[PDB]
Design a protein around this ligand. Sequence first.
Ligand SMILES: [Mg+2]
Ligand SMILES: [Mg+2]
Ligand SMILES: [Mg+2]
Ligand SMILES: [Mg+2]
Lengths: 249, 242, 249, 242
Amino acid sequence: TDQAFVTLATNDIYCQGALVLGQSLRRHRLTRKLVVLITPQVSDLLRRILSKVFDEVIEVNLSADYIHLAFLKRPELGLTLTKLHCWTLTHYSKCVFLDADTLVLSNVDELFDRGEFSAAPDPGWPDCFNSGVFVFQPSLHTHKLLLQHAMEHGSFDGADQGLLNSFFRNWSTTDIHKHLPFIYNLSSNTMYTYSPAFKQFGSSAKVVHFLGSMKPWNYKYSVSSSQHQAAFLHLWWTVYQNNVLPLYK
Amino acid sequence: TDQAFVTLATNDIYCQGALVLGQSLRRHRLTRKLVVLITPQVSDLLRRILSKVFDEVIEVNLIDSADYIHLAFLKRPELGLTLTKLHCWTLTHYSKCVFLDADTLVLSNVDELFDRGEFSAAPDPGWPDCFNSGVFVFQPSLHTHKLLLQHAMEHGSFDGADQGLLNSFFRNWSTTDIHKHLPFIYNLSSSPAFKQFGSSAKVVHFLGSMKPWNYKYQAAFLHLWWTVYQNNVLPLYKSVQA
Amino acid sequence: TDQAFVTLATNDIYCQGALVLGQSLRRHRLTRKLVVLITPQVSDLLRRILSKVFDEVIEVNLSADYIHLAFLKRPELGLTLTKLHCWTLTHYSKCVFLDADTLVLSNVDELFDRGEFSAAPDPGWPDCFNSGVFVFQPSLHTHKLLLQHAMEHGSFDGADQGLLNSFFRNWSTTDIHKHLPFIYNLSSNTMYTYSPAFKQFGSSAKVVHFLGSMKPWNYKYSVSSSQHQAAFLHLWWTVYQNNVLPLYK
Amino acid sequence: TDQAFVTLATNDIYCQGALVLGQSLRRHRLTRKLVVLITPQVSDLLRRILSKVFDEVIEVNLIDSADYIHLAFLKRPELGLTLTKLHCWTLTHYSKCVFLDADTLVLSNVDELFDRGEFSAAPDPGWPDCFNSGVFVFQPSLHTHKLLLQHAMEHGSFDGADQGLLNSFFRNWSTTDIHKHLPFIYNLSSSPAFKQFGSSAKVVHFLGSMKPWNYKYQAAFLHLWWTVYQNNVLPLYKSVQA
Ligand SMILES: [Mg+2]
Ligand SMILES: [Mg+2]
Ligand SMILES: [Mg+2]
Ligand SMILES: [Mg+2]
């Protein structure tokens, strides 16, 4: 197929997220390619392990002048621009990007029925999308425009979510079909309290997104944590213990 | 015109909210009628005060209503105030209305909301595939009202309030028509996003059980609320009380 | 019948509570007598109105030496001792006391199947009962013992709940049949937040108890109030507007 | 004897709670075995540390269990940790156990809890016709365990956690046998009542998502927790890490 799931691991620790994400996709009847972007900081060891899960392991480094300039002008956007490398994967016609701190709970192949740029609303400011999960179409032209926009204006939150919301500015007003249902990117903040909405709709979750400074891998050898958050932490570790830990050996 | 802003005051205390809301509407190029729905326990004094702001002060008595309304209240007593709010759909001398809860504040003219069709509302920041029911555009109709009450009798509300019930009834809001998604600035329930877009706020919604009238005179929006209360609401109390 | 519901109104304002309580009982198929205790501070006007609702309107004043001594020794317990006058109503064999800030949502005649001393648990410290609703048996001997206990030791909360829990000290350990289900005395604090328990069980409420400094009658010509609390406030005012307000005229 | 205290550590962080709990039990005339249930993600290092406190360190792997357990987890994935806690009923080499959550602290010997029969628990301060599931007396049995899991598959939990499920299963707790109501001092979830009876507290339960190990070293009970942590838990980390 000419379609893929894409994620990003910027260091050996974050590879744990990518590996769990990757295996969660394989558990639920994988029909697409799996791609992981990495930085030069990812060790040869983790590369061999990643290769047991991902069809492609692609190191992002420095490349054309238009890329160099953005990177050198705005060092703070180094990881953002690394993520945007996903738009250069032009051997795929359509991709779903998933951040390495997400977990797939069910087959989500229906996401490929969506067109660029499709994303779920972000809690807190719901007229912005969360950039942890989105459907895009690789294009060198789009990549150039994104980087020119990054170079020219930067990001209003210093991260990829601000840059992407700024570029795909009409997301909240144009076409409802590019609004992914919230269950395709369910923030782990939403389940800190057992709210009526979460009780009513939470069970239909297809992808969970672990936010906060405390990632799932930080719980294994001081920020508050919920029982219902803990539940999803346990699902993450179930995939890790059963589908990832064996790979390391 | 045949269009109106509509709010609800459920007792004399919450009238403080309705009055501030109403005055904030009158402040910014008033072109529509203003309506406040009230419960029977809203006192005569505050009816007189409300009358200085609102074009219609309409008492909703669920016991003295049509049988289907009376019955809905007896079967779902806990939804009495939700049913009182839903009474807005009985106002069929208006063709289209904008409902604003008494804990909202209008920062500028929002007459363009009447361009929207039923059912239009803004996303809720907690679970954004639900809309927040503090602000919406609707079209009065006895038929819709009856369908709403039938839904309430059969299913109640998953949050025990009007927002659960309205989301359950209008359950295709998050998937159907982007033009029925109000921008968040029309129901701004108050991050990097806030500093970026917060300034363009047109209607703020004070969420939580701690309402502006519970304090004794973020903090920016609260100051705007009290400014209107002191200047445009408190005098009404005094002049009617003389 | 030789059984009655009993409440207490210590001033004209609290009579509003007693009148709503009284009418709520009459709405739901009244089979027992209704009694209201009052103080000398209740006006002739409110007495005539109370008489339209209650079978007995009984003024509590100063009486035997054992009563006088308690009252004069501990002026802070004046209202507590006024409430305890309910135990002198020996022309009834069994009574249900209901505080004037409660509201009956359904016929509760089954409470008379209970024996003294039956009460519902108090939230916060559930090994104490809430004294807003209880089943007791009038007795001059019991009244003497209560007042002697009041005179000797007072109340650990300065109110009737501390005195009564102290006297009926074994409530939490002796016999489950004297534990009234929580729905016979549902605190309005419990519904400040939409807790899972309240969602699950709240609908079966038979008697609601309005606590906090802000009584229902304080809302009509600055403390936080909940939507679900508001719901019960509205039920109180429904009884008031329909069944009490006409009486005043 | 054939009796045990039982707790549950679901990850290395929450192990801090289990260790403090365990040490507080060892402090006050220890007469029973101590057991900690753990999830597979509890690290080897912390298993070694737990082994210095608990007589049994038992890993619960829902995927590698009997089919009815595996299936319950797949049908109710959100109840994974609840099912892990409910695994305490599989410990049939004990005839009776006392379960204590890892966010409790024992202030003195509570061996008299083993006089209680299944199912014994203290009232919950929020809705007191429900018991709080942080402390209870039970009797291990594969039969009860299967009934519990069948209940979980069919009904889930109304609060998404073990307390909803246990109250639904043992739903006659509030009406049946006063001797199965533990006094509140055996699960003191921390008023005039508190000052009066609070001093006799035997087991305190730190409710809320903010646990003792989330702070950086009322306030009285928290001091008691940290005292045990500093003196009796922290050294275990160091000695095993050498
Ligand atoms: Mg992320
Ligand atoms: Mg509101
Ligand atoms: Mg009271
Ligand atoms: Mg707990």
